[PDB]
Design an enzyme around this catalytic site. Structure first.
Site, PDB file in Angstrom:
ATOM      1  CD  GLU A  18      40.137  22.637  24.304  1.00 28.52           C
ATOM      2  OE1 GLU A  18      39.285  22.328  23.442  1.00 28.52           O
ATOM      3  OE2 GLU A  18      40.378  21.933  25.308  1.00 28.52           O
ATOM      4  CD  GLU A  64      38.111  14.748  22.700  1.00 28.89           C
ATOM      5  OE1 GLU A  64      38.147  14.666  21.455  1.00 28.89           O
ATOM      6  OE2 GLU A  64      39.066  15.178  23.382  1.00 28.89           O
ATOM      7  CG  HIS A  65      35.522  19.822  25.135  1.00 23.44           C
ATOM      8  ND1 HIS A  65      36.283  20.696  25.879  1.00 23.44           N
ATOM      9  CD2 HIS A  65      36.156  19.688  23.945  1.00 23.44           C
ATOM     10  CE1 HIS A  65      37.330  21.075  25.170  1.00 23.44           C
ATOM     11  NE2 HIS A  65      37.277  20.478  23.994  1.00 23.44           N
TER      12      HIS A  65
END
Ligand SMILES: CCCCCCCC/C=C\CCCCCCCC(=O)OC[C@H](COP(=O)(O)OCCN)OC(=O)CCCCCCC/C=C\CCCCCCCC
Ligand SMILES: CCCCCCO[C@@H]1O[C@H](CO)[C@@H](O)[C@H](O)[C@H]1O
Lengths: 48, 441
Positions: free
Chosen positions: B136, B59-60
């Site tokens: 994160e 996703e990154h």
């Protein structure tokens, strides 16, 4: 000297039969509840 | 019109399928804007301990450049047309979607096709994202809510793929390799596992042709030995307590095993959860709120907030509640909450169930407000139910619920069932599991 002689022994047999039943059952109840504590695990995660 | 005629006027969602297995679904409106995206049957439930976090890593990388649009080229193109590109990953689904002007639908579909099939995954970008993800993870650690919910899954589904977090353990983040990612991708990003959905001012036929044009190359085979199927996940009555007296408020999440997406019981369960409801210190209702839990909490200042939830997965789920409160209010909160589940199991009244039904009706419709919520409903529904459930059907399902159905369904999932409990913070007063378990009957 002990006219209650025969009756106490009859009652004794019933007491033994009843305890033979109740003790293992209550002991199982004890182990059941305590199992939560007996199998718990701990971890110490201090920030470093 | 009546609420009933309005229900029958919602355009029916159109569904088609390409040769490679890709499903194409859309709901046309007259909005000059739209949302189009790709929903995928991929998530951490599909990951093993070795590659847990792979999907989140991807996703990154998804928007960091494609073979056709290297680096920030994809980015510049999205921005210059005023579009918005977003994404999200959960334990079972992953989605990439774009909000754009309806007239830009062709370029939007091309970009999505490009993203999903030609992601660069440049070694240097992979190293950069590695550090972003680690940071994160640190930030997420400061979110007590996210922590407690990850803990609930970790304990409730211990020993199964559902116990895993979406982001994965930090050591996996440090070690995942491009090989690992390309591998994950070749295995999960196949046409039969994807749904191209769109809602807004567009026609199905246009979307379908754009799909044929841009997604046909997508693999629809894989093989036989490498077709990631899901095994049921065992639920475990258990407790995880992370005591940290340094935190100002305690967070507690408790749940029994839910039925899973496909089950009809979810409607009655949603009604019951609506009855108990949600609450937080900023609610204007206070002592007059209809939910007994809400008014007791408000008048007695028992918590800062609480929320019931019904988290669904394929064949299981978490049905329960989460609350935030002062260290001296945990036992009281748990007492009142469990008392309410028991009251519903044995004595739900027709009037409160009607309220619950009306709350659910309002939530359903108000949620499908805008092209993005609608597009997401289309994508997710196709993945979960295999079809878009129309509002008229939802109404029929809700209508079938009455006090009898609520008592029976609640009794089925809550009554004398072992819950999964997660606590974080100053939790010295969180009740012992045996006491919580006894509270279930
Ligand atoms: C106070 C707790 C002490 C318990 C005393 C138990 C006792 O007295 O025995 C009662 C009784 C014995 O049988 P009976 O029917 O009363 O005798 C008649 C036989 N023809 O039952 C027990 O022993 C229960 C176990 C304790
Ligand atoms: C608890 C009730 C379960 C069955 C509800 C079905 O409900 C029906 O579904 C159809 C197809 O979606 C709709 O066209 C129809 O209007 C609706 O009433």
């Amino acid at each position: 000297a002990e006219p209650e002689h025969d009756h106490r022994k009859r009652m004794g047999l019933k007491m033994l039969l009843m305890m033979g039943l109740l003790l293992p059952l209550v002991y199982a109840m004890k182990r059941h509840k305590w199992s939560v504590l007996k199998s718990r695990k701990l971890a110490y995660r201090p920030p470093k | 019109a009546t609420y009933a005629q309005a229900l029958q006027s919602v355009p029916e969602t159109q569904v088609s399928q390409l040769d490679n297995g890709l499903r194409v679904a859309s709901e046309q409106s007259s909005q000059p804007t739209c949302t189009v995206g790709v929903w995928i049957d991929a998530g951490s439930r599909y990951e093993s301990e070795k590659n847990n976090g792979a999907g989140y890593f991807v996703e990154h990388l998804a928007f960091k450049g494609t073979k056709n649009r290297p680096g920030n080229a994809l980015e510049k193109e999205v921005e210059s047309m005023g579009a918005h590109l977003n994404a999200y990953s959960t334990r079972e689904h992953t989605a990439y979607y774009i909000k754009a002007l309806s007239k830009d639908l062709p370029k939007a579909v091309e970009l999505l096709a490009d993203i999903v099939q030609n992601c660069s995954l440049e070694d240097s970008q992979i190293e950069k994202e590695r550090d972003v993800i680690l940071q994160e993870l640190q930030e997420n650690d400061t979110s007590m809510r996210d922590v407690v919910f990850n803990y609930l899954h970790a304990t409730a589904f211990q020993g199964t793929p559902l116990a895993q977090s979406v982001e994965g353990p930090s050591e996996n983040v440090r070690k995942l390799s491009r090989a690992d990612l390309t591998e994950y991708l070749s295995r999960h990003y196949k046409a039969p596992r994807m749904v191209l959905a769109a809602a807004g001012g567009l026609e199905h036929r246009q979307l379908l042709d754009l799909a044929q044009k841009h997604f046909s190359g997508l693999s629809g085979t894989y093989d036989e030995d490498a077709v990631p199927t899901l095994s049921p996940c065992r639920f475990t009555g258990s407790q995880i307590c992370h005591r940290e007296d340094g935190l100002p408020l305690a967070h507690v999440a408790i749940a029994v095993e839910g039925p899973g997406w496909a089950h009809p019981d979810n409607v009655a369960l949603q009604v019951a959860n609506a009855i108990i409801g949600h609450y937080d210190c900023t609610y204007g209702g206070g002592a007059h709120l209809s939910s007994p839990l809400a008014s007791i909490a408000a008048t007695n200042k028992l918590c800062q907030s609480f929320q019931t939830f019904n988290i669904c997965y394929a064949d299981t789920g978490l049905l329960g509640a989460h609350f935030v409160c002062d260290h001296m209010s945990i036992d009281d909160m748990m007492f009142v909450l469990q008392g309410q589940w028991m009251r519903l199991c044995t004595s739900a009244t027709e009037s409160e169930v009607l309220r619950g039904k009306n709350l659910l009706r309002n939530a359903l419709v108000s949620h499908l407000d805008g092209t993005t919520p609608v597009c997401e409903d289309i994508g997710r529904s196709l993945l979960t139910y295999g079809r878009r459930i129309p509002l008229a059907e939802w109404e029929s399902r809700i209508a079938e619920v009455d006090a009898r159905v609520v008592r029976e369904v609640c009794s089925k999932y809550f009554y004398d069932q072992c819950p999964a409990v997660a606590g974080f913070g100053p939790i010295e007063q969180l009740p012992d599991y045996n006491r919580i378990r006894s509270g279930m009957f």
